[PDB]
Each structure stands twice: as C-alpha cells, then as structure tokens.
Amino acid sequence: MVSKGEELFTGVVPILVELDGDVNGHKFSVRGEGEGDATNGKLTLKFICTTGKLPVPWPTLVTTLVQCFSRYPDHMKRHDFFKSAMPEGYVQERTISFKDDGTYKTRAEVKFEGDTLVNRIELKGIDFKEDGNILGHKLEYNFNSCNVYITADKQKNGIKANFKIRHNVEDGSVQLADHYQQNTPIGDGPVLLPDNHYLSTQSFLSKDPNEKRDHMVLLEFVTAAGITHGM
Amino acid sequence: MVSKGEELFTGVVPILVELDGDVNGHKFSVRGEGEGDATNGKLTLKFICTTGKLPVPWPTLVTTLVQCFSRYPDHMKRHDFFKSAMPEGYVQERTISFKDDGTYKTRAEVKFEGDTLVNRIELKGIDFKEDGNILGHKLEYNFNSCNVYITADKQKNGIKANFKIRHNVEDGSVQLADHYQQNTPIGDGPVLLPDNHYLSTQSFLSKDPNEKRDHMVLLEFVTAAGITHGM
C-alpha cells in the first residue's frame, strides 16, 4: 500500500535549496537546484554561493543542504517519516558542534511548493576561530560518513538523529563535527513514527569547470537499513 | 558506452550459489538461488544447508556466498572489474582469519552458465575452537560493515581487497574476521583495472517461517563510491 506521501516521490522530483547564513558575522547565501529520485535514493544538485566567496568550506554545509529522497526498501516503508510528512513537510533543526571551534545552529523547512521539494534554511555560526580549519579553509573537498541512526521522537511526532562527521584536514588531521538533529511535522496529518534504523549515504563532491562562481556539484546515493521485520 | 560485460547485467539476472565446505572435518553443502539487479545494486537470495545443520554461523558465510551485482554509478563504470570479466568470469580467493579462532580459505569461480550467474565455492576451515564463537554458534544473526576498499592487482589483471568484518557475539563482545581477497579473470579478454574505490553494502538476514531446513534469507544493496573523476 503506497502511502500518499510516498506517491509524491515515485518519479524524478525537482529540488530547490535556499540557505541564508551568518558565521561570525560573515553573511552569505547559497542556492542549489537539481533533482531527487527516491526510488534510486539518488540526489544530483549544484550549489552556488550567490554572495561571492563562501566563508566556510563546502563540506561543512553538506548535511545542512532532504532525507525524504532516501531509498527505503519495501519491507521498511512503514518507517519512512520523511515522505509521510509530505506535502506539508517537516522542520529540521540541528546543532553542529565543530570540536575546538564554533557551532552552527540550523532551522529548515522541507516541504513541497508546487511540484518542487524545497529545503529553506537559516544557519547561524558563532565562536569560530579566524584561522581555524573552518574560517581558514583547511578542509579537504570531500565527504564520508558510516551510517546515521534515526530514532522516533519519544515525546512527540517526529525523528531525532545524532551522528559525528569526520572532515579530513589538509595537514592529514581530522576535524570532528558532532550533529544533533530533531525533525517535526509541519502539518497535523498522520505520520509514520519509525523503529530504530539508519541511513547510509555515499557523496561525490566535484566542480563545474565552466562555473566561475564559488560552487559545489554534489551527487549522493542514500539507502535505509537496520530493520529486517516484515520481509 | 555500455561495455559488453555491463550489458549482461542491465536486467534481473538469476543467481545460483553452490558452496562445498569442510570446517575442522565437518562436511557441509550450501545451495542458494535468487536474482541480482545490478542497476539497483540489489541481491535477493535464499540459502539452504542441504546436508543438515550448518556447522558454522550463517553470518560467517555472507562474504563467501557476487560483487558483479554492485551498482557502479555512471561516472565510475570504467572502474567495474567484476562485470568487465563476464561472461567468462573471475576466480575469487579469500583467507578469512577469525581472531583467537580458526581460518577459512575459499576458492570460487564467478561466471555465467547460460543465463545464470554462478558462484561455485570450495571452503576449508581449520584450527577452529570446538566451543569458540564459530563452532559454538555464539554469533548474532545479522551482518554490518562500513566500506570494502577495492584496489587493482598491481602485478597482474585483477583486484584485491582486505577488510575487517565485526560479528556481534551473543554475550555483547565482538568476533573479528580479517578478510584478504584476490580476484583474477578466467579469460584472456580485455578487462577494466580500477583506480582505488570502495563498495558500500547493506545486508538483511531473515528466516522463511515455512522453511524447516537450516537456511538464510538475504537481501543486499551495494553501491560503489570513492572516485569523483569524470562527472
């Protein structure tokens, strides 16, 4: 039984991402466009800094810049909160604590505006070191993680996640980014509260050789796993 | 340019797996049947121990029981050795060293026999402890890993991999299984030697409630990543 939220994702869906950021008083905007193919768990986006030089490394923004495009295998569809909240969508909040450096706090609404899945984000960054790995642009241009665990919000409709991102630093050290995440449905419609499970994400960060603006080309594959009940 | 080996995988392909095993002199056979969908990197197999009780835990056999069904994204197809060797196929050899316990040595041929992709394996296990985690059946019925790195065989046509599998033990400890892998093409036809990359595998192990024989139902999703050149 393909749920109504699920039905919105059965084809290729256009994506718009808008981020307005302030890190230590550096104002920037990022705009991304592309498409999501939830059936294959495939994301293809190109992000532009529309205000000039991005004052943080692109890799620090990957997690902030649409978990509704996760490939949930058939036997796990009952645990897909992200599509069940659509089209009205969900609020996604994070604290991202960079070890020995500053903090990002993000608030986003992920929802349909007509035929497009929109992720509209506000980001505030404080306590960054002027010559640390983030404001100093010392992070390698890549992105790796090994499973983000998703859990039901146990006081209310929604999900939570906490996970650690390891950013390679150019000197061969590692910059830790501890993520705390809470998602709440925007509407009052029924949603699916999941059992514990995880999302596995592979990421490819490249450049468009003809693009002069500061930018990130991003390809992702995402698959849910960690529940075997009901197959 | 869809290579001829690639073309053999564009649909759903039937799979046959045959394993003849000897662990500490316990003779067993495993037979598996199902299908591979390389376009989605999806494997669905059911394995039977045709000789009675499997004398090792099913999870210890998952890696031995067809990397040609990996989803290689478009920009990485030139690095897919496993399909390039088809239909004549490849020899896949492993040593699997169980920490504080015995060793498996495996030799398999992965090739097409008519319309079916066949994995035919010989397994020899020695130096197992009669009451260790393997012959004692103390391993949880599940399977997790975080990336297997694939490299070109640098003296000859083929690939190598070494990776560590962590099997959960029922007391809450961990049984390490260190895998060393070498694959060689069976034919003399051109093959693709890859740049360094990895395979990401999600695994679901269940039971058929109507199956009385010792068995494992296995669903897998596999995606290649770790190269961004040429997108």
Query: Which residues, numbered 80 to 99 in chain A, qualify as contacts with chain B under a Cβ-Cβ cut-off of 8 Å?
Result: none
> Nearest to residue B108, comparing CAs of B20, B29, B218?
B20
Tokens of B64: 């031995």
| Residue whose entry in the numeric block shows the structure tokens 């909240």 | A85
> Nearest to residue B224, comparing CAs of B58, B64, B39?
B39
Resolution, rounded to a tenth of an Å? Answer: 1.8
Q: How far apart are CA A14 and CA A12, in angstroms?
A: 7
DSSP letter for A7, please. Answer: H
Q: Is the CB of B221 less than 8 angstroms away from the CB of A217?
A: no
Q: Is the CB of A221 less than 8 angstroms away from the CB of B71?
A: yes
Q: Which helix (H) or strand (E) holds B176?
A: strand B174-185
Q: How far apart are CA B18 and CA A14, in angstroms?
A: 45
In DSSP terms, A117 is beta-bridged to A15, A112
Query: Which residues, numbered 130 to 189 in chain A, qualify as contacts with chain B under a Cβ-Cβ cut-off of 8 Å?
Result: 142, 146-147
Report the sign of the C-alpha dihedral through residues A54, A57, A58, A62, in that order. Answer: negative
If phi over 0 gives left and psi between -120 and 50 gives alpha, with beta otherwise, what is residue A61?
alpha
Alpha-carbon Rg for chain B, nearest whole angstrom, is: 17
**Taking the CB of residue B109, how many other CB atoms lie within 10 A of it?**
16
Cβ atoms of residues B44 and B219 within 8 Å: yes
Q: Is B117 part of any domain? A: yes
| Residue whose entry in the numeric block shows the structure tokens 């645990």 | A79
Q: Is B204 part of any domain? A: yes
Q: Is B8 part of any domain? A: no
Q: How far apart are CA A195 and CA A212, in angstroms?
A: 45
Q: Is the CB of A231 less than 8 angstroms away from the CB of B223?
A: no
A to B CB pairs, distance under 8 Å: 48
φ/ψ of residue A68, rounded to 5: -60, -15
> Nearest to residue A78, comparing CAs of A156, A190, A153?
A190
Which chain B residues have a beta carbon less than 8 Å from that of A217? 231
Beta strands in chain A (DSSP E): 13-23, 26-37, 42-49, 90-98, 103-113, 116-126, 148-152, 159-168, 174-185, 197-206, 215-225
Query: Which residues, numbered 15 to 34 in chain A, qualify as contacts with chain B under a Cβ-Cβ cut-off of 8 Å?
Result: none
Q: Is A230 part of any domain? A: no
Nearest to A223 among B146, B206, B221 (CB): B221
| Residue whose entry in the numeric block shows the structure tokens 């039905």 | A7
Which chain A residues have a beta carbon less than 8 Å from that of B225? 202-204, 221
> How distant is the Cα of A209 from the closest Cα of chain B, in angstroms?
11
Please tell me the experimental approach by which this structure was elucidated: X-ray
CATH number at A208 reads 2.40.155.10
Which chain A residues have a beta carbon less than 8 Å from that of B203? 225
Q: How far apart are CA B159 and CA B191, in angstroms?
A: 11
Query: Is the omega angle on the peptide bond into residue A209 within 30 degrees of 0, that is, cis?
Result: no
Which chain B residues have a beta carbon less than 8 Å from that of A231? 204, 206, 217, 219
Q: Is A146 part of any domain? A: yes
Which chain A residues have a beta carbon less than 8 Å from that of B142? 228
> How distant is the Cα of A40 from the closest Cα of chain B, in angstroms?
7
Query: Is the omega angle on the peptide bond into residue A14 within 30 degrees of 0, that is, cis?
Result: no
Q: Is B106 exposed, middle or buried (0-12, 13-18, 19+ CB in 10 A)?
A: buried
Q: Is A45 part of any domain? A: yes
Q: How far apart are CA B136 and CA A142, in angstroms?
A: 43
Helix, strand, or coil (residue B76): helix
Contact with chain A for residue B112, Cβ under 8 A: no
Q: Is B4 part of any domain? A: no
Q: Is A101 part of any domain? A: yes
> Nearest to residue A83, comparing CAs of A64, A111, A106, A108?
A111
Q: How far apart are CA B130 and CA B4, in angstroms?
A: 48
Show the domain range for A101.
12-225
Which chain B residues have a beta carbon less than 8 Å from that of A203? 225
Which chain B residues have a beta carbon less than 8 Å from that of A40? 40
DSSP letter for A84, please. Answer: H
- How far are the Cα atoms of A143, B34, B50, B52, B108 from residue B27, in angstroms, in the given order? 46, 24, 11, 10, 17
Straight-line distance from the first to the last Cα atom of chain B, in angstroms, rounded to the nearest whole number: 15
Number of domains chain A is built from: 1
DSSP letter for A169, please. Answer: B
Nearest to A200 among B202, B205, B219 (CB): B202
> Nearest to residue B145, comparing CAs of B64, B199, B96, B104?
B199
